[PDB]
Ligand binder design. Sequence first.
Ligand SMILES: Cc1cc2nc3c(=O)[nH]c(=O)nc-3n(C[C@H](O)[C@H](O)[C@H](O)COP(=O)(O)OP(=O)(O)OC[C@H]3O[C@@H](n4cnc5c(N)ncnc54)[C@H](O)[C@@H]3O)c2cc1C
Ligand SMILES: [Cl-]
Length: 485
Amino acid sequence: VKNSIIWFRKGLRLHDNPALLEACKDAKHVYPVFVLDPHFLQQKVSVNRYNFLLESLEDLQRSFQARGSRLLVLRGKPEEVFPRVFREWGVTQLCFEHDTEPYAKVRDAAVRRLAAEAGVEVVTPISHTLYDTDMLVARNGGAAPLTMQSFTKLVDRVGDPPAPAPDPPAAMPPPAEDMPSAAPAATGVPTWQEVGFKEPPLTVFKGGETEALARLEAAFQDPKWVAGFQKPDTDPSAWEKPATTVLSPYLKFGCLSARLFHARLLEVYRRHPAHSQPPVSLRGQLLWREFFYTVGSTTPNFHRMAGNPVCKQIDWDDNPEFLAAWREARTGFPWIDAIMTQLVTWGWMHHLARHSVACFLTRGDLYVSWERGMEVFEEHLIDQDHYLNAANWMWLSASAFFSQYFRVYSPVVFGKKYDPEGRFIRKFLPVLKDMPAKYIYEPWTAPLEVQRKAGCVVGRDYPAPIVDHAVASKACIARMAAAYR
Ligand SMILES: Cc1cc2nc3c(=O)[nH]c(=O)nc-3n(C[C@H](O)[C@H](O)[C@H](O)COP(=O)(O)OP(=O)(O)OC[C@H]3O[C@@H](n4cnc5c(N)ncnc54)[C@H](O)[C@@H]3O)c2cc1C
Ligand SMILES: [Cl-]
């Protein structure tokens, strides 16, 4: 008979899951499997992203039960768990979504060999990205493009990406009854307290495929906003209704199909001929995701500086005092400390908001390595993608893709253009809620009668600025110009 296993790592979804469909085809029994590392928290990972993953698994659980099945959350490592359940369940086929990530390439190489030892068929379709990221390198001559212009001219020569796969059947072959490794008490979705977190999550974005589809339909309620989308013209100060889609946490874990997003974008573009074009368009943002995935999967040490052939060797300073003040939201700049607060509370900030902290820490003011700030993002960001994190942090440090270090944001004037009243600051930094808008972005310039009337004395309730931006930026820019020579 055909007993199959659909292995979930990314792509935590039922729509456009081309492996679920193969695993359910002519199958007597289907085993939805997610391998969960029981330790990991004893080795880095906030309770915001892990609970977002757990909520995404609970959404798959309710979706599989509504179709007569059940999600199996197995404990242990894949190399130790799969050889057991292969012969316990009589597995003849193993399906899982393809992953071009470095740890994944090793992990999958190991499982495949084990699946070949047990006479199991391995089917790995491509559905996490838009196109075969390897066909994009092959058609280009054998090398990945290094500019967005050249990549967008490449995908247009390939054509439209594959359409989203059809929905799975309303009834699925359930797991076999009375299997020891499929016991409900052992294969259940754990909560954030049971895995070893003593702190509750504070994010406002819930995980799951159901929430990803609902937030998708909400963004497409106004097709005029979808068509004329220009990313660089958005608001980094909007928090009640973010100026963007906020679909990156769902696209990272796979709760939302990139093929479904692109297909819905083309439907709106066909009825709006004057829609925005890449890279500023909504489709262009998906192409940024596809551009960095193509380059990083073919580039050695992409997540690092040393050994990276595409990164610029920069003598970044080792200054734990500046790094700690930056990650603890105590730099003295309310605009910076608000975004670094939104980082640990929500796990998501606007793209231009992430531009201000990454520039302030690196080539702008503190001259600290982009790897140090990337490690701080890798823990709090609920949308933490390996290739997208690394390329964007090299972008902001003028170490790759970006070479314009004379462009430094002011930790005081950038946010004032969008939010002169400081609504964003008063929300995430309530210690400055009564400060007048004239000194909200520069509290150290406020009079002391003013400071006390508002309950924020600089040096007692809110720290002074750790650096002078005019002095710090002048010194960092000069060193960047020497390195680029
Ligand atoms: C220092 C730094 C680190 C970042 N780290 C991450 C990360 O770990 N994960 C992550 O998903 N994005 C990362 N980004 C990119 C960008 O900030 C986010 O994708 C964006 O803020 C998410 O908002 P959204 O989902 O509303 O995007 P939208 O503007 O609505 O775009 C929709 C989708 O396009 C993709 N996208 C958008 N902008 C980019 C971009 N610049 N690069 C690549 N793909 C993009 C995402 O999949 C996103 O969900 C980083 C950017 C910076 C400057
Ligand atoms: Cl600026």
